[PDB]
Amino acid sequence: SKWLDGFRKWYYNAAGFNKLGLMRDDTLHETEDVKEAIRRLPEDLYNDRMFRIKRALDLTMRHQILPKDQWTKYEEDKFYLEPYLKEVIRERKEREEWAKK
Amino acid sequence: TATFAQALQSVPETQVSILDNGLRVASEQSSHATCTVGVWIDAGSRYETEKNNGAGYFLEHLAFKGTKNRPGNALEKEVESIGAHLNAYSTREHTAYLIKALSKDLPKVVELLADIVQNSSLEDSQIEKERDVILREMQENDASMQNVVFDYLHATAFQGTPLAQAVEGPSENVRRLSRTDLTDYLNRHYKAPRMVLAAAGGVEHQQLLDLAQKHLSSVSRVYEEDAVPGLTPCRFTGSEIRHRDDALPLAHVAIAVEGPGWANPDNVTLQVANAIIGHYDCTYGGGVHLSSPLASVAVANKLCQSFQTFNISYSDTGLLGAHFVCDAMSIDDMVFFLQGQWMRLCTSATESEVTRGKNILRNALVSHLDGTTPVCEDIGRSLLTYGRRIPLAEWESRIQEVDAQMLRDICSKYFYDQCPAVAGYGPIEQLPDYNRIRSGMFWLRF
Amino acid sequence: MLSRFLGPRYRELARNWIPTAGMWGTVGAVGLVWATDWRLILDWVPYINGKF
Amino acid sequence: QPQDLEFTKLPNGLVIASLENYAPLSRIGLFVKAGSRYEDSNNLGTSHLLRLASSLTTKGASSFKITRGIEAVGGKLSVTATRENMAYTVEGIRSDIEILMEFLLNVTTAPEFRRWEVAALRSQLKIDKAVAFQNSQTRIIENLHDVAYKNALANPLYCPDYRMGKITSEELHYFVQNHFTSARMALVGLGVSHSVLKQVAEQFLNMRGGLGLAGAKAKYRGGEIREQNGDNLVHAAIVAESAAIGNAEANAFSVLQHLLGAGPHIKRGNNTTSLLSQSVAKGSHQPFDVSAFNASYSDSGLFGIYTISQAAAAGEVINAAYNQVKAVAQGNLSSADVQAAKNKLKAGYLMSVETSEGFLSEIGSQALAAGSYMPPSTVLQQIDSVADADVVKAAKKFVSGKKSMAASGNLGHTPFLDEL
Amino acid sequence: MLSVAARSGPFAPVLSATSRGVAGALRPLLQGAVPAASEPPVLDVKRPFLCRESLSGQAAARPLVATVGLNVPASVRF
């Protein structure tokens, strides 16, 4: 329902990576699949992600967060890494199921 | 429909007959308008006795320079007047003179072949100029660096035997050889019981038999001293040779062990093993997805420029192994990887891997015999080596016998805990010593 | 999370490596009873029963 | 024995040729008129990357699936590109071939052309160009093509060095969607039934019914290029404008190249019946290699002489070869030499289609050009229908035309085009 | 007589190029390998010309004269 959407955006506010200007896909741990999906990114998305990570590192160095009018919000959190990551796990699963037999 | 076995048995049969001179006349027929007719002689570098070490090669040069009835280039003019192609080669065991022509000129070509094996006019001026030509192409073949490592591997693996010497021999023998020595070689080794007249393509077998009875009757048939030149088994030597020239950009290394020869069936199994490891060079367009583990490892780590596996067979002996060219900094790593692959085939070969190697060997055996020249080569070499033409259905039946257990048993028999023969040429100080290469040929975990 | 090795090839590898791993386990057991001088097995053997 | 070759022209312009011969392994090839003829100054080298893009991800199969599935059945995928057309050839054992066909289908119909894969592939095309230009004949022939034509055939087989790192996926997608259309393709199957090819063609060759983009119209300019590289040998190709394919003059020019000498017939031979080799061997006492070059396309042709000689004695070899062609251009020849030239030409043609690859390449080019089978006996009688005056007027058309010269090596004694 | 590569006898593999996307069972003869060649030197980013005012004077009018020195930069003037 819409209760689940409101509860997810409350959890989005409570987790706290929105306060550093980060996206959800920036917070993914850099495994091999994630690193390959970073390598398959276009250059503008790469530069945006690296600047967001560097700015979050600077803000956490100063133990500070952003002013509220440049926080990330639940609606405009675009999921840029999802199709690249989905294709990477589909290709790796295909290679694994080939090598199983 | 038609499955693989039905198409394999639909291939036409090779007809073999024997003349009164012992000449073995074999042919097979297709729908092709052309033909390939050749003479295969059982004469090579293995029959030479260290003082006539380039006699077969120098006759192989002078065979096309004129005969008794066709003096010089007029003979050459004759074959160009029919648009035919004339080729030859000389191995360590076999010599071949083959002609691609049209089928409609089957008689004349056989006549030409006749005097080429029995009426060659060896002239002194031709001897001088072909001595200079042979010196020129040994200088040319010194640049072909994989041929240099091939010769080095044969020398260091067959030390002390007549199978170490090259077909072209040393330079001093080229500088000093005389017409009497060539006459002795041709009187000793160009007799009719060792010759196979092979024909492939749109040629009638009875017509070729009539031509061989007309022309190639009474070639030699006589030893003239009752002295049969018999072949003797050659000792294999686990050894290393290191030609070091750091000015070269790339290094070639060939590693080998014994293989059983021509007339032992597990060669087929060994062929499957090579089909597992395969070949690669830098222009293959597969990427990081090649089926060979060594190829994928060498692509990912950027080790090789090329690698290539081989099985080489002579009379109850042979060389089985690999050969690679790479830069200096890669060499040691690849040796480790290469030996690991062999040990995997000795220990933990699977069934899909064996099936892939079997399909690769099926495609190699069938697609190699496309056209009359390789079919004629297979006919002549098979009558000289196996004593018969092995049909491709027999090859398919022997390939189907291969499963994983007998393959890793055979690979453990021929690779595991065996002393290799290593030849190298180039910047090869990262190529390890013989002790580490020998220690890499077994696993401490089995 | 060990579901990558559920196939016929890994079973083939397993039945290839049964006898070598079993023989290595036999080596380990014989070396352990040899080094420890364990009295359970060394009383079951003919020639080594000389010091007891 | 097989039955005769079977043809089908689908309504979207696709030609289908099939031969049922019950071969142990089958050969399937798709022939597309999408060579390097069809590029211009902005997308140079797109055909070189498209040549190496045969193992990338499509829809229906990934790169891993294509490579592992073709290598698992032991089959082979290759592609051969000439300056006018490309040919994608798969082969494999008969009981597998249908799955191989759909792989070729994907490679020829719907490439994905992702950006990261072509960014990986551009280094491979640099390495492939280096391997190809390791020998000197390829370099001098590509230079000769760049000098002889001003458009549409000066585009080389290999990508230029500035374009590497700059070919994007959009140029490949544009090239495929403008040149890989169904009215310019031929599907040829040796060792497969006609119904299988017709079923696969009706399944997934129904997307691009147009004739594509065409009409490049290569023009001739002439001139010379002189690559000084200081080698001990000097290579030199001197050509001129000659007739295209579709003419009896093309047969006359083939008879002319086999009359003057068109390569070796004897291992370590002297080329005695070659006229050019006879003239130069009467002249020069040093090793050489003179032959006749004839590249005939569908719109224009190049005919000339190709000489390899020593660095200092290059002028004598080149002038002797040119004067030999001048002497045979003035009627000074013998009919027995023309008959031997015809025999050489027909023997080379019958030996070309002797193997399965040459036969499939010949029938792919015939289906692309005319769409109908030319039997070998008709080719032989068309060779036999050439007079001596046709060869004389072909050599006269060579000698009176403005030449394109490409030279490579130590050119201190090599002449210029004003001194031939 | 089609197959434009086979029209030329010895110049069949020179007019054509045959890549192999999936290499088959039989290896080609003369596999071939690039030598480890050198690398060009690195240079700074140059001056682009995006207006008529910058392009003025760039057209050459005099023969090329080069100048080297022990402690002065190398120059070329046209």
From TrEMBL, chain A:
Keywords: Electron transport, Membrane, Mitochondrion, Mitochondrion inner membrane, Respiratory chain, Transport. It is found in: Mitochondrion inner membrane. Pfam families: UCR_14kD. GO terms for cellular component: mitochondrial inner membrane; respiratory chain complex III. GO terms for biological process: mitochondrial electron transport, ubiquinol to cytochrome c. InterPro entries: QCR7 (IPR003197), QCR7_sf (IPR036544). One of its GO terms (molecular function) is protein-containing complex binding. Component of the ubiquinol-cytochrome c oxidoreductase, a multisubunit transmembrane complex that is part of the mitochondrial electron transport chain which drives oxidative phosphorylation. Belongs to the UQCRB/QCR7 family. Component of the ubiquinol-cytochrome c oxidoreductase (cytochrome b-c1 complex, complex III, CIII), a multisubunit enzyme composed of 11 subunits. The complex is composed of 3 respiratory subunits cytochrome b, cytochrome c1 and Rieske protein UQCRFS1, 2 core protein subunits UQCRC1/QCR1 and UQCRC2/QCR2, and 6 low-molecular weight protein subunits UQCRH/QCR6, UQCRB/QCR7, UQCRQ/QCR8, UQCR10/QCR9, UQCR11/QCR10 and subunit 9, the cleavage product of Rieske protein UQCRFS1. This is Cytochrome b-c1 complex subunit 7. It comes from Mus musculus. The gene is Uqcrb.
